[PDB]
Design a protein around this nucleic acid. Structure first.
Ligand code: MG
Ligand code: MG
Ligand code: MG
Ligand code: MG
Ligand code: MG
Ligand code: MG
Ligand code: MG
Ligand code: MG
Ligand code: MG
Ligand code: MG
Ligand code: ZN
Lengths: 136, 135, 94, 134, 38, 176
RNA sequence: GAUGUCGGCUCAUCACAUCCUGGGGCUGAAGUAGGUCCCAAGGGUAUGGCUGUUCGCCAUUUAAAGUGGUACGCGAGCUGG
RNA sequence: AGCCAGGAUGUUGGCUUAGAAGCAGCCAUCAUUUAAAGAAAGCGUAAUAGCUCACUGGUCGAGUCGGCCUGCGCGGAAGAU
């Protein structure tokens, strides 16, 4: 399960998630799983999808995860009123904008990468598309 | 799936064997197991006969280059060719016994001298002996 | 030999370029040499199918701008963030 | 109509041939001695395949076939049992002169036209059992 | 009969058919493959 | 469309009567009448029937193919006729015909008496066989389905009323 | 410048995510008996031992002893544990 | 697309197992006759058989197949007077 090993600060402002992604090309592998939607990927979602694609390719080829859950998410438990400090960090998310290549793969045929990426996509909260490496 | 490169090559291989052979036999082979066929392929190679199943469209193309351009009207239904490249005869006799013993099929028409032989008059190339008989 | 039909752009900027893409067209630029850069508009479907061949990015292409023929090479490409569409192309005079 | 593989000079025990062919309607003492009387010419320690042809009146007629391809490659290489994982584990070696010896014997059952066609058919049986051509 | 939001062909003998505005999977080989979208 | 474009050959002895969308096909084996969908334009001429779409109707070609298919089996009906054969499987399962009524013994407390409709006739060559005959392909199919419905083939022994051409797949009972 | 709280009693009324009865598909459905899902709200849907209890556990029934909404239905209707 | 016909030989591939013969598993997956036929996609047998597919010849005679960009719809869709 992905998580920053250490951070400058424990907690983070909610912020917003406007714009289009940086890192929209297949940069390391032959194929990629790209975000078509906007949202938050949790470390558990990223791990579930990584497991699905890895089982599918029978741990053959190579896999790259282009996303990193570096944003801490706090939560207030039940029977706790408003205020009295910012809540405790429970989990980590990556902010996703339309166009991010989430995962990459090579060393496997296209048909197998499409199937492995189909299985991984079913674990994710945002709509995705299958992408291939291009000449420029 | 057969490509045009494949189709042209099959016409070429059967057009070459058409020129060299002396007596050619055209017949039906629908409803006959591979056990009896591999038995007629062993009986064919032995008698110097070339055995093939070719698409009737591909045959009308290999036969257009003369002298079997009369066998056209026998390229309707499953077609099996018997090209005798070594000694005229062999096939026309081999097929008649295979037809009678197995009861299936009928044997379409035979060809020799660049002339058409009907289904009833195939007794002409069935009574012919050896080369090798004049001595 | 790849032959691309283009028209010179009568406009420039954000508004004009988005209007082109809404009309199944896309802007592109031709630069290099002593000549002034030439801002052009391309048919999206025609150039999209062409660039699917790896030869588009290696070969010398010919852009036909009002009868005139311009020998070029694909320099850079701005692709749509997630759709199989082209946003803009840079051509360098060959 | 059943197919079996019985020894050169052995035919009678219950576990290999007994109720396997006896359940159909074949005489257990009539076939067992008529088979060994014809396979007497066949060498000791060589499993010979036989095909049974039975009719409506419990009568039978058999045609003796040449020893199997996976059978002759064991005595030529000097092995009792083949490899558990073929092409992953080598269990023996057979020369080009030994490949033509098995092929000349198998000629009565083989579909091939030439000697080179029958030799390649024995080459395939050797690779699928772990025996390498040397 | 399996009733679910995601109805698919489960084998070569499965057939997708729309009967009275309802997507169904009808199978000639396996009764367990019979589906209704709902 | 491929069905609609295929003309129906009306043989010698078959009379065809067209009153707009109403078609009457008379033959040796009886008379059949059908009202075709308004989207169907039927043309007689020669010894054939041709079918086409009617302008302004969105489903014309799909309708013309149905109309074709129907008129083709009407022609076959009034000449050759149709035959549906059913066979009874199971201990005590027997059948008999008494005029236009099929008496069926199918393991129930009361024997079943099935009244045949106009144009359908039945004969029992065996106590375990029902042969239906008629001009209407739809009505003969309906009667055969109705008779089969009294005891549809069971999956454990193949018992019941089955069609002669029916494949009844059986299965083993749950183990232990 | 007051909208009486839990539980019970009495009297109910609606929903359906159905407990029983009715129809049906699949079953790892032989039968009997079940499992699961679909359709169905017409009616029907225990009495007791303990505890203020609702619930729960227990005894013995029943075709069954449904789940919820109604100011956690109901004190200008009763009770007052 | 449908329909007619074939779907063979070495061979029951080797190992394992009471048996594993395409069809419990494990490993290999060539070669021959070929129009084509996987050392076998599923059902079946105690194991065989038997049924069918991948593939191919015939028949038929003009279209057929499923990805992309998009418009509008369909299911997913149960609540209490
Ligand atoms: Mg603006
Ligand atoms: Mg209905
Ligand atoms: Mg007041
Ligand atoms: Mg309901
Ligand atoms: Mg469930
Ligand atoms: Mg009620
Ligand atoms: Mg009970
Ligand atoms: Mg209350
Ligand atoms: Mg009071
Ligand atoms: Mg076809
Ligand atoms: Zn199915």
């Amino acid at each position: 399960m992905l998580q920053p090993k250490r951070t400058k600060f424990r907690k983070m402002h909610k912020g917003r998630n406007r714009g289009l992604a940086q890192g929209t090309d297949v940069s390391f592998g032959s194929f990629g799983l790209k975000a078509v939607g906007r949202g938050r990927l949790t470390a558990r979602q990223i791990e579930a999808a990584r497991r699905a694609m890895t089982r599918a390719v029978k741990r053959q080829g190579k896999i790259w995860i282009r996303v990193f859950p570096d944003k801490p998410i706090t939560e207030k438990p039940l029977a706790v009123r408003m205020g009295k400090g910012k809540g405790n960090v429970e989990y980590w998310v990556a902010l996703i904008q339309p166009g991010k290549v989430l995962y990459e793969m090579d060393g496997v045929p296209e048909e197998l990468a499409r199937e492995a990426f189909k299985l991984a996509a079913a674990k994710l909260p945002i709509k995705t598309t299958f992408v291939t490496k291009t000449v420029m | 799936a057969l490509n045009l490169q494949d189709k042209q090559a099959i016409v070429a291989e059967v057009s070459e064997v058409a020129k060299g052979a002396l007596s050619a036999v055209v017949a039906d082979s629908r409803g006959v197991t591979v056990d009896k066929m591999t038995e007629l392929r062993k009986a064919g190679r032995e008698a110097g006969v070339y055995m093939r199943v070719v698409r009737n469209t591909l045959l009308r193309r290999a036969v257009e280059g003369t002298p079997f351009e009369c066998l056209k009207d026998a390229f309707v239904g499953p077609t099996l060719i018997a090209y005798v490249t070594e000694h005229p005869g062999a096939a026309a006799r081999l097929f008649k016994e295979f037809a009678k013993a197995n009861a299936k099929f009928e044997v379409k028409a035979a060809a020799f001298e660049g002339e058409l032989i009907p289904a009833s008059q195939i007794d002409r190339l069935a009574t012919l002996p050896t080369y090798e008989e004049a001595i | 030999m790849f032959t691309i039909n283009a028209e010179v752009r009568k406009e420039q900027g954000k508004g004009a370029s988005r209007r082109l893409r809404a009309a199944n067209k896309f802007p592109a630029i031709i630069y290099g040499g002593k000549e002034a850069p030439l801002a052009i508009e391309l048919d999206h479907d025609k150039v999209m199918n062409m660039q699917a061949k790896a030869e588009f990015y290696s070969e010398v292409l010919t852009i036909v701008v009002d009868g005139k023929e311009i020998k070029v090479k694909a320099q850079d490409v701005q692709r749509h963030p997630y759709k199989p569409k082209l946003q803009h192309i840079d051509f360098v005079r060959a | 109509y059943v197919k079996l593989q019985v020894a050169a000079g052995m035919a009678n025990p219950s576990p290999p041939v007994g109720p396997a062919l006896g359940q159909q309607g074949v005489n257990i003492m009539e076939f067992c001695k008529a088979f060994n009387a014809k396979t007497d010419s066949i060498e000791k320690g060589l499993p010979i395949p036989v095909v049974i042809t039975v009719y409506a009146d419990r009568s039978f007629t058999f045609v003796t076939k040449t020893p199997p391809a996976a059978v002759l490659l064991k005595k030529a290489a000097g092995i009792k049992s083949g490899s558990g994982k073929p092409n992953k584990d080598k269990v023996g070696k057979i020369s080009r002169a030994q490949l033509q010896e098995i092929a000349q014997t198998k000629a009565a059952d083989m579909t091939g036209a030439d000697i080179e066609a029958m030799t390649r058919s024995i080459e395939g049986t050797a690779r699928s059992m772990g025996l390498v051509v040397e | 009969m399996k009733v679910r939001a995601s109805v698919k062909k489960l084998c070569r003998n499965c057939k997708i058919v729309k009967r009275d505005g309802v997507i169904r999977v009808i199978c000639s080989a396996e009764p367990k493959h019979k589906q209704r979208q709902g | 469309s491929r069905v609609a474009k295929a003309p129906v050959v009306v043989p010698a002895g078959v009379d065809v009567k067209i009153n707009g969308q109403v078609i009457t096909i008379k033959g040796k084996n009886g008379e059949l009448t059908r009202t075709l969908n308004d989207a169907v334009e039927v043309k007689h001429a020669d010894n054939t029937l041709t079918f086409g779409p009617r302008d302004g109707y969105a489903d014309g070609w799909a309708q013309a193919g149905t109309a074709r298919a129907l008129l083709n089996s009407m022609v076959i009906g009034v000449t050759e006729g149709f035959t549906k054969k059913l066979q009874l499987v199971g201990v005590g399962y027997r059948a008999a015909v008494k005029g236009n009524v099929i008496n069926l013994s199918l393991g129930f407390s009361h024997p079943v008496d099935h009244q045949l409709p106009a144009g359908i006739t039945a004969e029992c060559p065996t106590q375990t066989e029902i042969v239906l005959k008629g001009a209407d392909k739809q009505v003969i199919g309906q009667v055969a389905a109705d008779l089969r419905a009294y005891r549809r083939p069971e999956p454990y022994k193949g018992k019941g009323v089955r069609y002669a051409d029916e494949v009844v797949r059986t299965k083993e009972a749950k183990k232990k």
